Design a protein around this nucleic acid. Structure first.
Ligand SMILES: [Mg+2]
Ligand SMILES: [Mg+2]
Ligand SMILES: [Mg+2]
Ligand SMILES: [Mg+2]
Ligand SMILES: [Mg+2]
Ligand SMILES: [Mg+2]
Ligand SMILES: [Mg+2]
Ligand SMILES: [Mg+2]
Ligand SMILES: [Mg+2]
Ligand SMILES: [Mg+2]
Ligand SMILES: [Mg+2]
Ligand SMILES: [Mg+2]
Lengths: 79, 158, 283, 120, 51, 50
RNA sequence: GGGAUUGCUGACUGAUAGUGCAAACAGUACUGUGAAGGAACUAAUGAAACUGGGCUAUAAGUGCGCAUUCCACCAAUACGU
RNA sequence: ACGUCUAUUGGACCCGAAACCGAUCGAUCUAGCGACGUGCAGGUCUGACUUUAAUCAGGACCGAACCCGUGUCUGUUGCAAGAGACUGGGAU
């Protein structure tokens, strides 16, 4: 009867009929061109005077290893 | 298996404005996917030697950022990225008619297309590699040119 | 965005580079590094040496006292500081900018019409009052108000007229002998705070404004005297609405619960600043 | 360096670079965090190469996209393309590396695991 | 081996952001990865002010 | 006056009337959603998507 | 009373029947603003209506797959293979 | 007791109302209200203010954009489950 319980049952019902977006989901997929849906991005800042300011600690940093060249493990193991 | 949840337009309207995180960690084990599209064969020969192009277009997932694509290319592939331009695309609709005629309709997963403009690596900048004619003569020739024909119809024979 | 442990590295780097004692160096490293100053080493050194090279060019300018008295001088370029005090000095041929750049960091940005005209209008606005000189040396770095870009000289004229209207000009002159930060308040907000103080600290009757206007007017004048004496004793009592207009009584009872009633406390609070701890407890 | 995703560069010549299999979880449990970090980066770059290479050809992946493209099950000579088989092995390797990392994160005792679940 | 990996908050070695990862818990970051987060926007302004 | 065109489309009004949140805002809307679930409808509300 | 496994259970039904659905995706397509309503479609065989032309004018065998009971190993108490 | 035929209670040989009682969904059509915003070509008359002057009023008049639908004709499984043409009414 609670609000969260109804939403959880809706999501469990939507767990079935999932995968590559068949049926009604083909039309419902076009809601992203109709109501400005925000995608799964991480926000890097905030507007103060309408000019966006990217906070430098929220800029993306990738900890790549020192050398991936002549490293002795490949993505494939011999049979 | 846990997968993509349904979202609701009223829910994103009500619980709106995602906030920036308080801390950002350097990303060990990143989950980010890029792929090129088709290149012209002369561009493919341009990549085969010296490994460079001024403009390369990529397919990504729509949860990425221009900063993330620029940082990933600079960090992993050693490139110099000047600017990124991102386009959000819908999936293609697919039709796969069944044993009884049903018109089974699919939709590909939504993708983001990035246009990445590159920069010459170090000292190699000569490979930008490009008489006159008056623009008054250009416009006057393009005004006396024959018009484009109207588009034929798919049943029409010409 | 700071690298973890950069605070110790910056404190050590300031000692290893330009001469500065560790306590004021820690003030630059910690207190004035929430913003207000760039955190980069090899950039504070360049500006500090460049501002150290401006002490001969200006007669009363000491770099160390100026950078500690107001630490936002180093977030601007040293050439801009040189031009800013030069142009402000031409708009104020009087006490030199060197003793004044260490108290006011406002003329780094809006010097030309701003600091000179506001200072001239404030000196004339207090000279047309009962003999107030208003030399600029007494100004504190919290006096960004009444000098910031956006207050008109007419607004200062209205502010001093309202200050000598809300307080009596003998009381306003005694109030302005200490802590000129009362000029920062707008006249409507200053009127609101003084009326709320007169309501809560009403010595005439109850917490309500007792003795409404022969002897009722005498009690009302005594209430105006008591609030102006508290303002002379402490300028921070004018900052009551930051807590609330109705929490002035709450802070007064937080002081009241210990021993006795109101009349003993009107004598006690006028003799010692017991309200500062109560306001800090409310914050 | 765009040659890395630009092509296999061994496929235009008629030779096969990878003739092997994908990593398994029991072998991946024996590798250290640094070795798993380097293998993860090498495997993601291999994933970008294989996705680009099967994007130049018009061949599906995942065996669920094949139903969408109306391509028959098994008897199509498309599941037998080398790039698709390598792509499935690379996805298995990345999934198994993720599974090993959460197993090691769940195998801890103090607040170090709250930091171990922040880099995975 | 689990013999190493113990809580080592001070294994920094003090390199601009190669100490950030082992402070958040790391052998060697690539120079290209640190080149991606540009460290020369303030350096050019410092050099121009010095000259 | 010709009839038949009572449906004037608007995304704001459609989501604000028959969306998830107005259904969840009231108890009887929540039993409407519950019997939509018990019937087995693939689309729970007019604004659901993924 | 209710929710899932099993039925050497059925003088129950056998695709206009039996659940609304035996099906690649049935509470689907589709209808309606909405609550809500809500189909058809198995594999062979190929009746009639209908429309053109013509005319008239030996209740058995043999193979496989299991189930029952014998046997010999059994957890040794229902059979375990 | 079985078999058959009647009878009673059940929906009780089948199909068919207008109904009544509850509690879901609907002001995206339409009626009223409320908040914010926008529009009213060209002229005509009357009253007022100021005039070295680039202002206002009238449920004013004629008349486009716009709103409505008086009369006639066409149409009547129509272009349209209420439309078209020409005349019309309002248009600060
Ligand atoms: Mg854009
Ligand atoms: Mg009309
Ligand atoms: Mg309709
Ligand atoms: Mg049936
Ligand atoms: Mg049938
Ligand atoms: Mg039936
Ligand atoms: Mg059949
Ligand atoms: Mg026949
Ligand atoms: Mg009988
Ligand atoms: Mg309603
Ligand atoms: Mg008209
Ligand atoms: Mg008329």
């Amino acid at each position: 009867i609670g609000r969260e319980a109804v939403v959880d049952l809706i999501q469990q019902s939507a767990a079935k009929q999932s995968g590559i977006r068949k049926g009604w989901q083909v039309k419902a997929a076009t809601w992203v061109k109709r109501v400005h849906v925000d995608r799964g991005d991480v926000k890097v800042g905030r507007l103060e005077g309408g000019e966006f300011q990217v906070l430098p600690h929220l800029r993306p940093r990738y900890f790549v290893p020192a050398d991936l060249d002549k490293f002795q493990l490949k993505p494939y193991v011999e049979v | 298996e846990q997968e993509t949840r349904l979202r609701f337009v009223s829910s994103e309207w009500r619980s709106g404005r995602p906030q920036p995180p308080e801390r950002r960690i350097p990303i060990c084990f990143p989950n980010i996917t890029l792929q090129m599209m088709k290149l012209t064969p002369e561009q493919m020969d341009q990549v085969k030697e010296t490994g460079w192009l001024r403009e390369v277009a990529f397919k990504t997932t729509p949860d990425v950022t221009k900063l993330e694509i620029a940082a990933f290319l600079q960090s992993v592939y050693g490139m110099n990225v000047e600017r990124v331009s991102t386009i959000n695309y819908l999936g293609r609709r697919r039709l796969a008619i069944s044993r009884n005629g049903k018109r089974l309709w699919w939709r590909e997963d939504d993708w983001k297309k990035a246009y990445v403009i590159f920069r010459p690596p170090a000292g190699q900048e000569h490979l930008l590699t490009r008489q006159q004619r008056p623009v008054i003569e250009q416009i006057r020739e393009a005004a006396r040119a024959p018009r484009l024909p109207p588009r034929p119809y798919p049943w029409e024979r010409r | 965005d700071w690298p973890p442990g950069y605070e110790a590295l910056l404190q050590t780097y300031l000692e290893q580079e330009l001469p500065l004692s560790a306590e004021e160096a820690s003030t630059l490293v910690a207190a004035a590094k929430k913003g207000l100053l760039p955190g980069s080493r090899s950039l504070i050194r360049t500006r500090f040496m460049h501002i150290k090279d401006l002490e001969p060019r200006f007669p009363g300018f000491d770099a160390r006292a100026a950078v500690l008295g107001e630490p936002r001088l180093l977030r601007h370029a040293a050439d801009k500081v040189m031009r800013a005090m030069l142009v402000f000095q031409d708009h104020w041929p009087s006490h030199p900018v060197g003793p004044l750049m260490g108290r006011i960091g406002c003329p780094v940005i809006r010097d030309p019409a701003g600091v000179g005209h506001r200072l001239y209008a404030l000196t004339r606005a207090l000279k047309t009052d009962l003999h107030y000189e208003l030399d600029p040396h007494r100004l504190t770095p919290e006096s960004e108000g009444f000098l910031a870009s956006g207050v008109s000289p007419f607004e200062l004229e209205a502010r001093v007229s309202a200050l000598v209207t809300i307080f009596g000009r003998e009381g306003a002159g005694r109030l302005l002998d200490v802590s000129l930060d009362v000029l920062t308040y707008a006249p409507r907000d200053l009127d609101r705070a003084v009326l709320a103080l007169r309501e809560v600290f009403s010595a005439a009757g109850d917490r309500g404004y007792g003795r409404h206007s022969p002897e009722g007017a005498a009690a009302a004048a005594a209430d105006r005297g008591y609030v102006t004496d508290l303002a002379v004793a402490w300028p921070g009592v004018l900052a009551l609405p930051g807590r609330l207009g109705g929490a002035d009584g709450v802070a007064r009872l937080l002081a009241r619960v210990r021993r006795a009633g109101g009349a003993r406390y009107r004598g006690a609070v006028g003799r010692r600043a017991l309200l500062s701890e109560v306001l800090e407890r409310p914050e | 360096d765009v040659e890395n995703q630009g092509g296999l560069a061994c496929v235009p010549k008629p030779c096969v670079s990878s003739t092997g299999r994908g990593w398994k979880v029991e072998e991946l449990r024996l590798k250290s965090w640094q070795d798993l970090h380097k293998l993860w980066y090498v495997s993601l770059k291999e994933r970008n190469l294989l996705l680009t290479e099967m994007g130049l050809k018009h061949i599906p992946k995942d065996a669920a996209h094949q139903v969408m493209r109306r391509i028959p099950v098994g008897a199509a000579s498309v599941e037998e393309d080398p790039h698709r088989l390598r792509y499935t092995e690379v996805q298995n390797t990345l999934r198994h590396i993720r599974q090993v990392l959460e197993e090691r994160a769940a195998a801890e005792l103090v607040p170090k695991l709250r930091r171990e679940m922040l880099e995975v | 081996t689990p013999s190493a990996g113990f809580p080592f908050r001070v294994r920094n070695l003090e390199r601009i952001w190669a100490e950030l990862q082992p402070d958040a818990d790391x052998x060697x970051x690539x120079x290209x990865x640190x080149x991606x987060x540009x460290x020369x926007x303030x350096x050019x302004x410092x050099x121009x002010x010095x000259x | 006056g010709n009839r038949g065109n009572t449906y004037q489309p608007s995304r704001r009004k459609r989501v604000n009337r028959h969306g998830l949140e107005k259904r969840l805002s009231t108890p009887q809307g929540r039993e409407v959603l519950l019997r939509r679930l018990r019937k087995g409808r693939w689309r729970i509300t007019v604004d659901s998507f993924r």
